[PDB]
Symmetry: C2
Subunit: 699 residues, 2 copies
């Protein structure tokens, strides 16, 4: 069902959740002044969600969430990323530098407090109501310093919601000793992670396992050999009951961002500026990239990370536009607007209408600047690799005109380091020359001369419109065109050479214009934000908060729905559950992304499923539900009617791409790995039987 | 249900058809001694099926069956391919050169008569039992020729069935005045042409409409202004009643070929020789062709057809090999013969075990020759375009040696003409040289020196193993290597230059070996053929014809089944009926194949469906059914329980690719346009009301 609901809004949605089939008592789920299930959910490493699943602080999250920790501990001799990792005792669990989980200990509405404090500010246009700094001063005042010393391991944060109409203060408890316990092999963790991505049906066992360490009192500590497993206040029970079509499902986690209150005019800017330009520019780029990879297997190895990441956002823009074309996302947002404008007339408050119109006027005023910004961002900053070639720092330049021959040698070395990072083993000068001519030919068509970055004027003024000649010249004459050319510079480096380096001048010139457009555009955000406060204040006051959730902002939200398949198109049905069968169907042993693990393949043939198979002897892999999730929800616990853990959220289907702006009940689905499958893999692929022992597994 | 059954087999199968939902009386479907539905079926233009749907000789078949006729009547001022075509009176219907329809007027079993005649052949290994030249003699004798003079418009033919254990004599009624009446625009006839090819779901309105003209008596006659519409013996009534899941469907038509009685050793050869080599060699070919098409907009246009043509049987091979890999085709065939061998033991007759062993032994003996044939057929004869460059005829050679200038120039003219048709507007020697190098490298890798075509020995001996320099030389020195080179030859021709022309030597040498290998493999066919006659005789004696149909052979068969969807893979369920919404869902005005017709589009937005809509107010397009069809069944009528026309067959799903060898009930499906959609396009897109008025449309 629609919405990413504040924990504070559980009471107000408890009956609908009962309607859909929630069995828990409300306070067992979220208790605002005691222990509850909420206390078992964590923000994992700042972006993902995870959950505690044993009284020794064992934490589950996605494989894609643990990926970096698994890679950092992997080499040629012991490639955990490929083979997996299962520490057979707690001492073999690996610490991670720069890792966190965070608990949401307390949450409290501090709206009236914050609004009282905001009346002390003179300027009625102050943006302090959304300043993190200001909001932190208020938080520190209420807590209030020395709060962190008096409460070791806790901190406080205030955040804004409903465009500045509601304020929450969060008391967080943060741990930074979190060790890798286990992960499956990449053939399970990422089964088809580029082809099957954004896609249902899905067969990916996207999980990994960690453990929170603490000091002997259970309070936070940085890594030390003294530290011992956390004994948490709450962990999730794992259920073997499985799922059935229409079963209740709910999620807690940390959705990042949504745009639920966009005006129609913002839908038009979003479609015809952000997305069209992204789609256009990324088509040209991927064009040249694809043909170069097909024409050379070396280039294919080098450019398929970069080509891949260019898709995973391009594709999101294709899908987003498809939602405006076919799902009337615009007319939906126009309707919300008019309902409110009418309503403001009936009440004799015209300010709602004025807010909407102040947004439209602002959107209209900034359209060419924004178009120029997106052109340069997508076309040059993201689009041409030599856009990010090295530029000397102040300090470096200063050294190269000094007399300190060794400060001369140090500055060169920092640049040699950045040069080799730019021109690494995945960089091809010739590929990027091709990419550049295409991207620049599109950029100069779409951007008139007197709006160009200063160095791009040279194409007309010096190369007689010849873009090839301009790019060739950059590489022929630059100290960053080849290893040779850089080396020759480093031998007799003058500050004068770098000042005329045409690649330096390019990279600087385009960055000046990116920066300049960004700064010109920044003042246009304030009126839209101020107008939104009013717009949303109106929307809440007219209907209510009950069917109008607050935009996500990387705070703890819950969402509910049912396990349910859907129909993506005429005469097709996807059901609610995938099976291990479906993994084997997709096998292609000569495709990296569809490799099937020898032990898993073997566990399949021998039907060796413990009591992790379903009512008919089929081994489940993944299921999907009507929950409302987004980026940030990676690793979120999925709970059955008794708040028992039934799976981990890991993706959203491509038909719900536009669900950060409008939710589509018949299409949007959360994509969840089945907890039975997670266990099977622990048990039968890992053989890491100690982890099943410590969970509290139930019917 | 499995089977392409003989009309002779209707009585044996009639109960099974009643069980599946058949209503009508047997003898209204097929009667040897009078009029029956069978009389409404035609062999349309050699390879398609069609059906008579009015008392004035109106004929429906597929659009892809009517394609060439439509394209032949299209100029730029009136492009009927693009816009459709609708004659508004019978006198506007457009004649067609080299066209026919063929009724099957009678069918007699002539097994005994054919067996008697074959005892007078002394050699017990004569292949006369399968000879068309011979069987036509026995036909002529039985029919007392001059039969075609005594009965103008009629003719006779005998064919063999069940590998020579059953003969039928057909009496054919051939009309050759057959005129274009109605086509929908290609956007409907070929909606999704190549994306949706071999695919369910499907949204393609694949029909066209013709009329049979004849003389005053309704007797056949070539085109003439004096000709008027044929009053046929039977036409189909058209049903507005529609389809539901599990409704009886049945088809009549002319399936081309099947290999249902393959031995498991025939399956293994087909996989590892025939299919694997085509897959290997076409992958290569197609790769090189893609690079170049992506590389140059003009090569794409030049080479798109040829690439698609290569893609056809490549995809078809890929599917067959899926089915062997995962559906146990070989096991099914192995089981077949295992049962008959066991049963033959029991009878005390080794006949069958001796036969199967012979097939085994012959398939083993011919494997290297056959591996060589497929390597040369896929690798060069089809792979390399300049393999089909001109070779001088006996006659042209003979004229370039004479003293006859007139004959010398006529020779050159003929050669110029074949040169222009080979080096035509779609021909690129750069592309051809690139393909040729990829393909020859694989060929010289597989095929050793002693088995090369003679000219290919030059790579090793003359060009130091450098395939690229060989192809360079062929083009550099050949008279067919460029237009100018040819013209320098035409000015001063001589046999000696053609004799030493490296391209002529290449194309001669590769065709010599191709012919040569074809000829050495020819003797191996007879043992297999004769052994098959015994093998199929044994299976029939053992298990009867009940659930054992005779291989297709371009003769009239019936098939039955039910309208039913299916699950193509895990968690995916395709249903039985597609809708006009599905068309709309696919609209994509930039992509050529998914353009939607404005007038069709408008009928949808108006819900202007008359009595064509299904009872829930939705407009059907296509349906699928478990009928057993193959190539030859294009345009075939689909009938309901009462034998009323409910649709037109036009494709098979790829999931059923192995259907010609192994029928896959849960997976294989005939793809059928709903006759209600057909009428919709006549009514609301043609506006061609007279065609509906002349039909008999029942509820």
């Amino acid at each position: 069902d629609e919405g990413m609901w504040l924990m504070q809004q559980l009471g107000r949605k408890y009956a609908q959740m009962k309607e859909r089939g929630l069995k828990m008592k409300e306070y067992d789920l979220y208790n605002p002044n005691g222990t509850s299930l909420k206390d078992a959910v964590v923000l994992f490493d700042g972006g993902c969600t995870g959950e505690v699943v044993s009284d020794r602080g064992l934490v589950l999250t996605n494989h894609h969430c643990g990926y970096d920790m698994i890679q950092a501990h992997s080499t040629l001799e012991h490639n955990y990323l490929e083979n997996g990792f299962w520490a057979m005792r707690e001492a073999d669990e690996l610490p991670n530098k720069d890792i966190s989980v965070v608990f949401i200990d307390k949450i409290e509405d501090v709206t009236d407090y914050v609004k009282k404090e905001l009346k002390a500010i003179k300027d009625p246009n102050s943006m302090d109501y959304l300043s993190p700094k200001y909001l932190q001063k208020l938080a520190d005042k209420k807590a209030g310093k020395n709060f962190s010393a008096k409460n070791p391991g806790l901190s406080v944060e205030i955040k804004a919601f409903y465009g500045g109409n509601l304020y929450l203060m969060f008391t967080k408890k943060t741990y930074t000793d979190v060790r890798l316990v286990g992960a499956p092999p990449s053939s399970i963790g990422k089964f088809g992670a580029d082809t099957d991505n954004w896609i249902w049906p899905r067969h990916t066992g996207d999980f990994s396992i960690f453990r929170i360490y603490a000091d002997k009192n259970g309070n936070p500590a940085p890594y030390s050999e003294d530290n011992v497993p956390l004994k948490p206040k709450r962990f999730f029970n794992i259920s073997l009951g499985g799922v059935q079509e229409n079963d209740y499902a709910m999620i807690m986690g940390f959705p990042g961002t949504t745009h639920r209150y966009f005006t129609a005019s913002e839908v038009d800017e979003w479609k015809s500026i952000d997305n069209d330009i992204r789609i256009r520019m990324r088509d040209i780029r991927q064009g040249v990239m694809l043909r170069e990879m097909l024409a050379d297997p070396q280039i294919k190895i080098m450019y398929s990370a970069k080509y891949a990441a260019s898709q995973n956002a391009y594709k999101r823009a294709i899908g987003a536009n498809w939602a405006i074309k076919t799902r009337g996302l615009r007319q939906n947002k126009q309707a919300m607007q008019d309902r409110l404008i009418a309503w403001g007339a009936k009440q004799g408050t015209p300010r709602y209408e004025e807010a909407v119109h102040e947004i439209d006027a602002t959107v209209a005023k900034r359209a060419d600047l924004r178009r120029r910004y997106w052109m340069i961002e997508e076309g040059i900053i993201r689009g041409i690799e030599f856009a990010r070639s090295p530029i000397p720092t102040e300090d470096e330049t200063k050294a190269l005109q000094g007399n300190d021959a060794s400060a001369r040698k140090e500055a060169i070395d920092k640049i040699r380091t950045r040069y080799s990072k730019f021109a690494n083993k995945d960089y091809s000068a010739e590929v990027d020359k091709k990419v550049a001519v295409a991207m620049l030919t599109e950029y100069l068509k779409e951007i008139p001369y007197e709006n160009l970055p200063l160095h791009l004027r040279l194409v007309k003024d010096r190369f007689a419109g010849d873009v090839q000649a301009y790019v060739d010249d950059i590489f022929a004459r630059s100290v960053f065109g080849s290893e040779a050319q850089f080396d020759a510079f480093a031998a007799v480096p003058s500050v004068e050479k770098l000042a005329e380096d045409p690649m330096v001048l390019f990279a600087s010139s385009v960055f000046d214009e990116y920066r300049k457009l960004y700064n010109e555009l920044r003042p246009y955000d304030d009126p839209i934000l101020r107008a939104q406060r009013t717009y949303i204040a109106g929307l809440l006051e007219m209907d209510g908060d009950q069917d109008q959730f607050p935009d996500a902002n990387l705070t703890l939200r819950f969402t509910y729905g049912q396990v349910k398949g859907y129909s993506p198109r005429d005469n097709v049905y996807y059901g609610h559950q995938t099976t291990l069968d479906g993994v084997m169907e997709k096998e292609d042993p000569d495709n990296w992304e569809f490799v099937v693990d020898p032990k898993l393949k073997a566990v399949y043939e021998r039907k060796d499923f413990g009591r992790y198979a379903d009512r008919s002897g089929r081994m489940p892999v993944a299921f999907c539900a009507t929950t409302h999730t987004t980026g940030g929800n990676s690793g979120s616990p999925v709970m059955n009617a008794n708040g028992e853990l039934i799976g981990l959220n890991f993706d959203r289907n491509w038909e719900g791409v536009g669900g950060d702006i409008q939710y589509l009940a018949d299409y949007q689905r959360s994509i969840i790995v089945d907890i039975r499958y997670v266990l099977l893999v622990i048990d039968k692929v890992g053989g890491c039987q100690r982890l099943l022992d410590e969970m509290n597994i139930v019917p």
